[PDB]
Swiss-Prot record, chain A:
Changing residue 21 to I: In strain: Alpha/B.1.1.7. Glycans are attached at residues 14, 22. It comes from Severe acute respiratory syndrome coronavirus 2. The gene is S. This is Spike protein S2. The chain holds residues 696 to 744 of 1273 of the full protein. Changing residue 9 to L: In strain: Omicron/BA.2.12.1. Precursor of the fusion protein processed in the biosynthesis of the S protein and the formation of virus particle. Mediates fusion of the virion and cellular membranes by functioning as a class I viral fusion protein. Contains two viral fusion peptides that are unmasked after cleavage. The S2/S2' cleavage occurs during virus entry at the cell membrane by host TMPRSS2 or during endocytosis by host CSTL.
Amino acid sequence: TMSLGAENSVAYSNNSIAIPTNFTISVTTEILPVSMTKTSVDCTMYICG
Amino acid sequence: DSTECSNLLLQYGSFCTQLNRALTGIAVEQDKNTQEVFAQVKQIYKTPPI
Amino acid sequence: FCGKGYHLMSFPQSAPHGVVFLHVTYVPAQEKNFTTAPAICHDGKAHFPREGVFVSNGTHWFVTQRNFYEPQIITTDNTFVSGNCDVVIGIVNNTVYDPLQPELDS
Amino acid sequence: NGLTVLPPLLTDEMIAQYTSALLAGTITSGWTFGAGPALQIPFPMQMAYRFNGIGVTQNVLYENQKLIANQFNSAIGKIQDSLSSTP
Ligand SMILES: *[C@@H]1O[C@H](CO)[C@@H](O[C@@H]2O[C@H](CO)[C@@H](O)[C@H](O)[C@H]2NC(C)=O)[C@H](O)[C@H]1NC(C)=O
Ligand SMILES: *[C@@H]1O[C@H](CO)[C@@H](O[C@@H]2O[C@H](CO)[C@@H](O)[C@H](O)[C@H]2NC(C)=O)[C@H](O)[C@H]1NC(C)=O
Ligand SMILES: *[C@@H]1O[C@H](CO)[C@@H](O[C@@H]2O[C@H](CO)[C@@H](O)[C@H](O)[C@H]2NC(C)=O)[C@H](O)[C@H]1NC(C)=O
Ligand SMILES: *[C@@H]1O[C@H](CO)[C@@H](O[C@@H]2O[C@H](CO)[C@@H](O)[C@H](O)[C@H]2NC(C)=O)[C@H](O)[C@H]1NC(C)=O
Ligand SMILES: *[C@@H]1O[C@H](CO)[C@@H](O)[C@H](O)[C@H]1NC(C)=O
């Protein structure tokens, strides 16, 4: 049975905050298709030669 | 279950393969959609008891 | 929309029948716990952060920007006053420095 | 007649678990968990940050915190009643 993710119980309280002291410059990739191959079919030539 | 019908159906080619492939693509697409919408966090957060 | 994290910039790259976006994003890291309060009570007045948040390392109170830890002394220049201390729930008592005070003191 | 229904990859309890994780992240950490590690913040302070996002000062949220909480609870109850009462 698949596991969704690791459990991470956030330590919530009414008077505590978590402030970052450092940072990471992360570069991620996103691939998006833009076009397809331009195909033309001669209907008469395809069906009848 | 008709053998004769299947034999005649084979003359038309790979129509059945095309339809099955399209339905399989739709079926995997639905799961991909559910993953995209709901599985956006890799940590399962939980609320405090209080 | 433009990568995981706070988006800084993006770079386009051509691909066969497609585009690849290199998303440069800012990710917070190395977080630390601090004790926080909504407002600071000083001279019977409630002080709220102009752009940051009040944090405490255990004994002293400072104001810092929300996305990076940079503690600064709580002054009148980075806080604003609205109302007294009787309305805000969870207000704590701390001093608020005045930059103008040494100028007329000297 | 040859028709089959494939079960979904994510079951209802797992989808509910995902929604629960999202709710816990957005309540306990605000928007921090969506951009990186989940940073805890008190919920009134988070609401004050959201108020600042739409151009309203923090003092307005803090002074009228009880009224805002009452309005939010009333609205959530009205949402449940409206869903239960509308076909
Ligand atoms: C913030 O994290 C960076 C890493 O991204 C730390 O930089 C490293 O510092 C150590 C010790 O000075 C070096 O040995 C590493 O080579 C550094 N890494 C890089 C990529 O330069 C940085 O010191 C951290 N800052 C704080 C305040 O924790
Ligand atoms: C901030 O404080 C909380 C609690 O004071 C810390 O949460 C605990 O961390 C320990 C260390 O791994 C765990 O064993 C506990 O189970 C955590 N408690 C809960 C309720 O999650 C938290 O790690 C602290 N964060 C920082 C950055 O110091
Ligand atoms: C919280 O931060 C303040 C500011 O750095 C700390 O105050 C300094 O503490 C050191 C060591 O005790 C002293 O040498 C400095 O003179 C203090 N500066 C001031 C302006 O008082 C404070 O100790 C920190 N609190 C904790 C619990 O670490
Ligand atoms: C924060 O400061 C205020 C005012 O200096 C404190 O309020 C006083 O509390 C004492 C003790 O109950 C009363 O006798 C005074 O009449 C109060 N004065 C005012 C103006 O309200 C308050 O108790 C302090 N809070 C903390 C946590 O130290
Ligand atoms: C947080 O809750 C405790 C009790 O759980 C209470 O005594 C304290 O005053 C609360 N602090 C704030 C800022 O609401």
